[PDB]
């Protein structure tokens, strides 16, 4: 709808606002900017601009609003749902040159970052100052504003939460070029509508984040892990309400079945330390002294042995921790190395319905003759489920992928869960959001994007757009 193609007069007017070494046109774009880690959709932008400041972003958004050109913001290109792909091919704003950490407030325990600070270099910076950024998505090369725009969460969400719980303030640029400050270094907020909480999870469809203020915690010193074998995944997922109600809250609660562990053993070349069982619970406790960590895990280990665990294995050493957590950290790459291609599902369910959904994917894998390996976080209900193509031909794979994905998203609808808990909706999961939420629920989302972006220029046909 009404989108003006970028012509040579628009290249000259853009190169007056931006230095020409940060503007890329045509054959100097690169194939990496035509896609993200979804891999299904490919679409080149017409202009790639590597912005460096808030006022440079606002001058581009003023030009694209005046000349009716769509704009897609891009971080590291890491997201898995096609959210940063420019389907209409307009301006692509690229933020990895704004990788400066602007301020570390040790009085308020906040850090001010630019969009494009990587998660691996922010968490390295704050831990040198004995501080802690708790959200840990699995890919550390992600842009921080990409984590804010996708509401990226990870392993520590059972104790600490997700990126939404640690965004204190945002400086955003709207589609017409207006610069808006949203939060601040405050802690309590009850002044008006929380526009900051709309930007968290919006996936670049409302505004362009040009500054972020992140809440930090004091860094825990000690860390100890527990490995608890179980007979099946029903006994493993059922111990999680008893663990949390014993007031010894783990930092991470991970379930892994034996079939997923056999992939990581073949990929890494090393065996798992004990794989005489079918299901596992991998805990993590943190603290500041060795004695209060020891009181935490011995509470859960005396508990877990009383409800049918075969054993409790203490993982207390940096060599023992690397022998267990590099197997968990290589679950995704071991599944990729075993197949031709795959597709990812990241449904979140209620926590008491984890075991029934994992057992459902085992009955679905036997029925459709596809390999469906799965893992996830047993402390919050997010399950990472993969449908592997293996050796199916292209016609039989597209029919089997569409049937396996439809039945898993319909079963999570019956279980009163959602479509995505980590990765977002983007382009790939739009029709499952229209199946979960009604048309009246998505008309509220589309009317909010019409408020922030009435010309529909900031990322068209994403999340709610054409569900």
């Amino acid at each position: 709808m009404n989108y003006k193609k970028v012509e040579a007069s628009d290249i000259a007017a853009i190169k007056e606002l931006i230095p020409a070494e940060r503007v890329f046109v045509g054959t100097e774009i690169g194939e990496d900017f035509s896609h993200d880690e979804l891999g299904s959709i490919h679409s080149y932008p017409e202009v790639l601009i590597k912005v460096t400041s808030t006022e440079e972003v606002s001058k581009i958004m003023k030009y694209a609003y005046e000349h009716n050109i769509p704009v897609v913001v891009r971080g590291s290109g890491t997201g898995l749902v096609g959210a940063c792909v420019p389907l209409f091919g307009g301006i692509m704003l690229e933020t990895t040159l704004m990788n400066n950490i602007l301020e570390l407030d040790t009085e308020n325990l906040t850090v001010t970052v630019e969009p494009g600070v990587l998660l691996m270099e922010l968490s390295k910076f704050v831990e040198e100052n004995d501080l802690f950024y708790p959200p840990d998505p699995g890919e550390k090369s992600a842009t921080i504003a990409g984590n804010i725009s996708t509401n990226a969460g990870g392993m520590r969400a059972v104790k600490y939460g997700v990126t939404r719980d640690y965004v204190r303030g945002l400086t955003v640029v709207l589609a017409n070029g207006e610069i808006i400050e949203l939060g601040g270094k405050i802690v309590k907020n009850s002044s008006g509508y929380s526009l900051k909480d709309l930007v968290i999870g919006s996936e670049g469809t409302l505004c362009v984040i040009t500054k972020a203020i992140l809440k930090l915690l004091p860094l825990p010193k000690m860390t100890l892990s527990l490995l608890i074998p179980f007979e099946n995944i029903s006994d493993a997922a059922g111990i999680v309400p008893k663990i949390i109600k014993s007031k010894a809250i783990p930092t991470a609660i991970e379930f892994m079945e034996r079939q997923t562990i056999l992939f990581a053993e073949d990929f890494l070349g090393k065996k798992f330390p004990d794989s005489s069982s079918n299901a596992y619970i991998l805990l993590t406790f943190d603290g500041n002294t060795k004695e209060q960590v020891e009181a935490e895990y011995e509470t859960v280990a005396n508990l877990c042995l009383a409800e049918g665990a075969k054993d409790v294995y203490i993982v207390d050493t940096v060599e023992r921790k690397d022998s267990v957590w590099s197997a968990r950290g290589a679950f995704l790459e071991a599944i990729k190395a075993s197949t031709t291609e795959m597709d990812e599902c990241d449904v979140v369910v209620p926590r008491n319905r984890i075991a029934e959904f994992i057992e459902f994917t085992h009955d679905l894998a036997k029925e459709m003759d596809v390999r469906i390996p799965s893992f996830g976080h047993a402390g919050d209900g997010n399950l990472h489920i993969y449908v592997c193509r293996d050796e199916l031909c292209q016609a039989d794979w597209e029919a089997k992928l569409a049937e396996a994905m439809d039945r898993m998203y319909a079963k999570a609808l019956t279980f009163e869960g959602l479509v995505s808990g980590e990765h977002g909706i983007g382009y790939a999961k739009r029709k499952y959001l229209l199946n979960d939420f009604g048309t009246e629920h998505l008309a509220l989302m589309a009317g909010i994007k019409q408020t922030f972006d009435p010309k529909n220029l900031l990322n068209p046909k994403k999340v709610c757009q054409m569900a």
């Binding site: 527990l226 490995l227 090393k270 065996k271 798992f272 330390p273 004990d274 060795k290 011995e298 280990a301 005396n302 042995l305 054993d311 409790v312 294995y313 203490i314 993982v315 050493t317 940096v318 060599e319 023992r320 022998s323 267990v324």
Partner: protein
């Protein structure tokens, strides 16, 4: 087979170590000491042989009374009994005096069909207590074992590796073996075994009075031929060098660097 001795050591919990320029003693960050990871492969090698042959496993350590924790740690992994060699006259020892008091504690504990030492420690890195210990015992020894092909009740068929070959040997009992890194994945210490009594075993401590050669000239610092003179951080330097001018002007500079680092390429 049946009787198996495992020599384990308590090491610093991390090797990130720097010296004060005029203390002369190590700037160790803390003391969250652990069992060394190279002896976890030696403990795991004994556990696979006990599951095949059905004997017993004894753990042996030499150090202070703080080294009783790695003897209890080996109990949680599945060791049957332990023995500390704690005495004030044993400290300050080099390899020659450590492998002598470990061989004297072995003769006090009776005969063993197999002694399993690890590849090396993480503080000394000398990797030579094992071959020196089997000399005082008079038993044959094989170092750097990556694979046990056969586990007969009289002897073992081993795979000893070199830098470029694989020697296959048939060594009989009694003998010492030195396994190296990643022969197996070591099992984790069980918390269910920790709640048995505290553990069933009850570590048996030995001093110089218990040895069959009770003369302190051969133990400790008195029986050490070597001694440290000074310890200092290693001098390393990063030099960024650039090379432009294409053709074989860069290829002579790349061959000049690969021959200076003795790659000969």
């Amino acid at each position: 087979m049946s009787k198996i001795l495992v020599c384990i050591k308590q090491v610093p919990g991390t090797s990130n170590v720097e010296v004060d320029p005029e203390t002369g003693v190590l700037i160790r960050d803390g003391v969250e000491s652990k069992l060394n990871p190279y002896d976890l492969f030696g403990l795991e090698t004994a556990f696979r042989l006990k599951e095949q042959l059905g004997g017993t496993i004894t753990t042996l350590s030499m150090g202070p009374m703080q080294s009783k924790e790695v003897l209890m740690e080996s109990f949680y992994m599945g060791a049957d009994e332990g023995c500390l060699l704690s005495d004030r006259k044993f400290g300050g020892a080099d390899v020659v005096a450590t492998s002598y008091t470990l061989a004297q504690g072995t003769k006090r504990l009776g005969d063993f069909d197999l002694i399993i030492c690890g590849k090396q420690t993480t503080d000394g890195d000398t990797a030579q207590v094992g071959p020196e210990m089997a000399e005082f015992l008079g038993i044959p020894h094989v170092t750097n074992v990556i694979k046990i092909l056969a586990a007969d009740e009289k002897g073992l068929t081993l795979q000893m590796n070199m830098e470029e070959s694989l020697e296959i040997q048939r060594v009989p009992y009694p003998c010492l073996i030195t396994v190296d890194k990643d022969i197996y994945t070591p099992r984790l210490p069980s918390y269910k075994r920790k709640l048995d009594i505290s553990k069933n075993p009850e570590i048996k401590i030995l001093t110089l009075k218990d040895m069959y050669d009770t003369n302190e000239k051969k133990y400790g610092l008195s029986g050490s031929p070597t001694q440290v003179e000074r310890i200092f951080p290693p001098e390393s330097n990063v030099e960024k060098t650039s090379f432009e001018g294409d053709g074989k002007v860069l290829a002579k500079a790349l061959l000049g660097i690969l021959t200076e680092k003795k790659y000969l390429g």
